[PDB]
A paper describes a structure:
To define the structural basis for drug binding, we first sought to determine the crystal structures of a mammalian P2X7 receptor in the presence of five structurally distinct antagonists (A740003, A804598, AZ10606120, GW791343, and JNJ47965567). Surprisingly, all five structurally-unrelated compounds bind in the same pocket formed between neighboring subunits, which is juxtaposed with the ATP-binding pocket. This drug-binding pocket is surrounded by thirteen residues projecting mainly from β-strands (β4, β13 and β14) in the upper body domains of the neighboring subunits. Drug binding seems to be mediated mainly by hydrophobic interactions, especially at positions deep within the cavity, involving F95, F103, M105, F293, and V312. Despite structural diversity, all five P2X7 antagonists fit within the drug-binding pocket, highlighting that the size and the shape of the drug-binding pocket play major roles in determining the affinity and specificity of the drugs. Notably, drug-treated P2X7 receptor exhibited similar levels of fluorescence anisotropy, which drastically decreased in the presence of unlabeled-ATP. Together, these experiments strongly support that all five P2X7 antagonists are allosteric non-competitive inhibitors. Our data demonstrate that all five tested drugs are allosteric and non-competitive inhibitors, which is in contrast to the previous studies showing that A740003, A804598, and JNJ47965567 are competitive inhibitors.
Residue numbers in the entry:
A (entry chain A), B (entry chain A), C (entry chain A): 34 to 347
Write the structure that this text describes.
Amino acid sequence: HALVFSYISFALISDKRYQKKEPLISSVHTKVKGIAEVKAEILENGMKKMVSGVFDTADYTFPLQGNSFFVMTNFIKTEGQQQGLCPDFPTARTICSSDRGCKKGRMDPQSKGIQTGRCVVYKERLKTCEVSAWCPIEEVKDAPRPALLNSAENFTVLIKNNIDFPGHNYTTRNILPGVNITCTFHKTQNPQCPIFRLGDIFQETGDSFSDVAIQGGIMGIEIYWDCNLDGWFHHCRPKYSFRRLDDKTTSESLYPGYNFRYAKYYKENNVEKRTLIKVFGIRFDILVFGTGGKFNVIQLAVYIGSVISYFGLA
Amino acid sequence: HALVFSYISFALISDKRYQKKEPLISSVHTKVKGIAEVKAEILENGMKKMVSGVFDTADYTFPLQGNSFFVMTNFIKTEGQQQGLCPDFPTARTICSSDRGCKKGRMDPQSKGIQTGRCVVYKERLKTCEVSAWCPIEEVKDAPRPALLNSAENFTVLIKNNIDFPGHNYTTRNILPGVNITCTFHKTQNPQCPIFRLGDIFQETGDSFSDVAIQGGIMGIEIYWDCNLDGWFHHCRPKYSFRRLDDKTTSESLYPGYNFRYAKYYKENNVEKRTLIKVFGIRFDILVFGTGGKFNVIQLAVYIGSVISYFGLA
Amino acid sequence: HALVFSYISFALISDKRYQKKEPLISSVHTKVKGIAEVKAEILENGMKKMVSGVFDTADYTFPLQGNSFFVMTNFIKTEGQQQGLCPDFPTARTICSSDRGCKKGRMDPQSKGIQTGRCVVYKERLKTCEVSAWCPIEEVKDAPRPALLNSAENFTVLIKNNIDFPGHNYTTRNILPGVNITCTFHKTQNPQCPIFRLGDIFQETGDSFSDVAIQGGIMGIEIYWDCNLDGWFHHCRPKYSFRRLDDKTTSESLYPGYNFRYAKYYKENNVEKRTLIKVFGIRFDILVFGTGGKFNVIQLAVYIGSVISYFGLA
Ligand SMILES: COc1ccc(CC(=O)N[C@@H](N/C(=N\C#N)Nc2cccc3ncccc23)C(C)(C)C)cc1OC
Ligand SMILES: COc1ccc(CC(=O)N[C@@H](N/C(=N\C#N)Nc2cccc3ncccc23)C(C)(C)C)cc1OC
Ligand SMILES: COc1ccc(CC(=O)N[C@@H](N/C(=N\C#N)Nc2cccc3ncccc23)C(C)(C)C)cc1OC
Ligand SMILES: *[C@@H]1O[C@H](CO)[C@@H](O)[C@H](O)[C@H]1NC(C)=O
Ligand SMILES: *[C@@H]1O[C@H](CO)[C@@H](O)[C@H](O)[C@H]1NC(C)=O
Ligand SMILES: *[C@@H]1O[C@H](CO)[C@@H](O)[C@H](O)[C@H]1NC(C)=O
Ligand SMILES: *[C@@H]1O[C@H](CO)[C@@H](O)[C@H](O)[C@H]1NC(C)=O
Ligand SMILES: *[C@@H]1O[C@H](CO)[C@@H](O)[C@H](O)[C@H]1NC(C)=O
Ligand SMILES: *[C@@H]1O[C@H](CO)[C@@H](O)[C@H](O)[C@H]1NC(C)=O
Ligand SMILES: *[C@@H]1O[C@H](CO)[C@@H](O)[C@H](O)[C@H]1NC(C)=O
Ligand SMILES: *[C@@H]1O[C@H](CO)[C@@H](O)[C@H](O)[C@H]1NC(C)=O
Ligand SMILES: *[C@@H]1O[C@H](CO)[C@@H](O)[C@H](O)[C@H]1NC(C)=O
């Protein structure tokens, strides 16, 4: 019987039932550092074109919102779009033999414009259904075979996390004062370092960075706080882990990868015009969770209340 | 007494107290599909004007951030604003009889500019207090009677949700592999379908889509995960519900509806100029919550501890 | 013994163990009101320049996302940047005596461009390492000594919070119907008022607004819901508190303050060009948390189960 009582007490200390768990409040501020030199040859409208230039912080990212930030790793640029009438891009759905194939007003999910009910030539006696939209229609083409900002794995992200427990009135930040800021996060060498190379994060998660960077993806950074408020056993430090949140469906219907359509509006020769930039990139989700533990007398009284009857039966 | 013990055991199985609840981690990636053809007549500065064009994905929305995305359903465009001196728009607060009514430097909450202390004609011997701001002052006028992007109810939103329970080390996504992607969500016909028509969501919540689309609103999509990790009773699927989070105050002081002031900056004839686009739309909040349940021995020991003393009293 | 039983019952009522706690769902919609007149003298490239104009809502803020909104309090504008070759800005790392000091291709964390391996004059026989980037390189200079939008403390923010408890099926909003909207939040005078002056929030947190506004910071607004669902003791109102989430590291390596690099792209004389606006401001994080309490029979049965054995021992 005594060993059952003792296994009860040990169950208390091991489960930490004497402490009252408190939820975790987290705020995140991130600063991304690095630049990328882009020199590549991109085929546009069947003609070879040269993409060159340097991309600094303002070019490939924007400030974090909703505990998540994004890094553009690749892109496809269509310029000079203007509202008008224009044959749709040749695809399995758009090709037409005659005007009967196109219904005036028909909207297709792959199509970016409303059909005009006419079947017209796109190029060299190959006819698509004419549509009304921003034109010329953006190409239906694959992403660049090497991601233009393939240096995205070399950039470094600095994460600054502030956590507060209101029930215990305890506030602490991810970066303790006096810590040597110059470090690169490592699983064993620098567990508390807040500077993470993106390629390091992809190596930890086992996913090759380049492949994800070609068509875009969603990565996730987990910050764990297992915190104890008792003065005789106190420790409130974060544990960094990395997980790939992207589904990797690899199906055209499921919209694989992470990419969005950017629209820049300008006026030229007294004409309303748009430049459409298809943006491919890796969005990093920062997930912070924690429990605050302090000795609660009432919780210990309820636990004792259970283990007294559980105790007498032994 | 035996029926009290048995009602205790049944209370355990029914409340699932033997399992330890775990918090839910959710990440959301959404892709919106559809286009809207806009043809309408809008009165601008007392003169009839024609608004026409096609709006594709890049025009009426932007990528989701903070587990929420927005769809512009209506708009009001003021163009050519430039910094300068200019009579404010005629309202109950702005109309002045003489220069004494305007105090130089006075800032009014409805006014977008600082008064210059002068009372000047706006149009046809009707005087407003002259202000310093981006001018001409945007009209104080109602939204278009039919929302310009009234097709907003026909668009379809694809929601992709990844949930993880860290305590149980269990990860699953909203879309199971192999599910037929071609579907439209229905309460009974397609409960697991991740494609939702916006008008479907507004019909479920009982709110007419057009009315909300005229002046904007805030809609909310709820995803519930009641998940059980035990191998003998395992089920971890989402439940979709829809709720209107917008307050619908319908009071000018409470800023009714959802709308924001967009600023596009350009330079013309060596002059700094701005175009102000008042954006009306429906912001969709995706709310995901869940509990992870697995058999915990210590929890069962504490419960047993209570029900043994509760038991002996019977 | 009777006093131990009674201290148990009092422990129940005081800890509210008879009620089952439910998590809190929060959605936030905020509308910011006010304008700022900016008249200041800013030194640019060693030459005095005059910054003047009026900033309305669209100029200094954008809609809240992820339960947080931002207000630009200060800025530094570099205009006319274009891709090319150009000497880096003179700093401790950039100054070069000869071409040997610069390595072709070297990327420096403080530098915004890739070195070309050449050491060239910046101004008056003072040589920096030549780099390839958007040029001229933005100045490495301090923020304006008075924040250009120093009126940021006078603006007013309206916060509208909707909370829902799903387990109890109870929904309520921050603003009750019929409340006089005209109010300014005060700790004692107006505890339920949803209109907060920014300078009021900084006075509550004890941080001078101007200092934070010069280089930017992160502020946090806490909304507490302690809600009871029982009809005989029902109260579900918010408690507003204010806390400064910014770390205030004041170290160049830790990127002190809150600021981000904004990029506006334009084309001039058939040349791709960029204007880089360094944005300093105060980001307000709205944190809402709550517990829903209703009488649960099973919870009371487990508590009774503990306190019966705890009871008999006395
Ligand atoms: C949130 O705060 C903002 C911060 C920045 C911007 C500007 C912006 O849209 N930049 C985009 N990046 C580029 N171009 C564009 N657009 N980067 C390129 C720079 C040169 C040449 C490029 N060529 C092709 C594609 C991208 C290019 C981005 C979508 C961030 C990748 C807007 C913000 O919101 C108002
Ligand atoms: C987050 O990523 C971004 C994605 C896109 C944009 C461009 C943008 O502001 N588009 C806006 N939409 C339109 N015009 C504007 N501005 N749509 C119209 C298209 C033609 C004619 C229109 N005419 C009147 C009103 C809107 C029009 C929008 C505010 C989204 C409704 C910026 C982003 O942040 C950098
Ligand atoms: C999210 O919805 C958007 C709402 C607005 C904008 C426009 C914008 O970027 N405005 C910026 N504010 C200014 N200029 C810029 N850029 N304000 C100035 C107005 C005159 C003169 C100024 N001069 C210097 C610095 C700022 C100035 C801001 C970054 C908000 C401070 C973009 C949005 O995303 C698509
Ligand atoms: C990252 O930097 C290292 C060292 O400069 C270089 O060897 C490597 O090729 C870079 N990676 C990419 C993708 O450019
Ligand atoms: C939180 O703890 C600090 C510790 O010094 C104390 O000064 C402060 O008053 C506490 N907060 C409250 C609300 O009691
Ligand atoms: C920080 O660490 C780096 C390398 O680990 C070292 O070069 C540097 O001197 C350290 N800084 C301090 C202040 O110790
Ligand atoms: C949505 O589409 C249907 C079928 O094309 C059409 O009958 C309906 O009028 C559309 N709704 C709007 C608001 O355009
Ligand atoms: C989570 O479960 C999987 C199941 O195969 C296992 O391989 C993995 O090691 C587990 N994670 C941890 C941290 O133990
Ligand atoms: C999916 O369902 C649609 C209609 O419900 C049907 O036309 C289509 O053939 C289905 N796809 C598969 C692969 O069964
Ligand atoms: C805020 O407004 C008051 C009253 O108009 C004024 O005295 C004060 O100087 C203003 N503050 C700033 C920073 O402009
Ligand atoms: C929530 O409570 C209201 C109170 O009238 C009730 O009408 C509604 O049916 C309840 N919801 C559910 C899902 O039972
Ligand atoms: C609201 O309060 C203000 C000042 O506190 C007062 O001037 C106004 O008349 C009040 N409104 C109502 C409807 O009572």
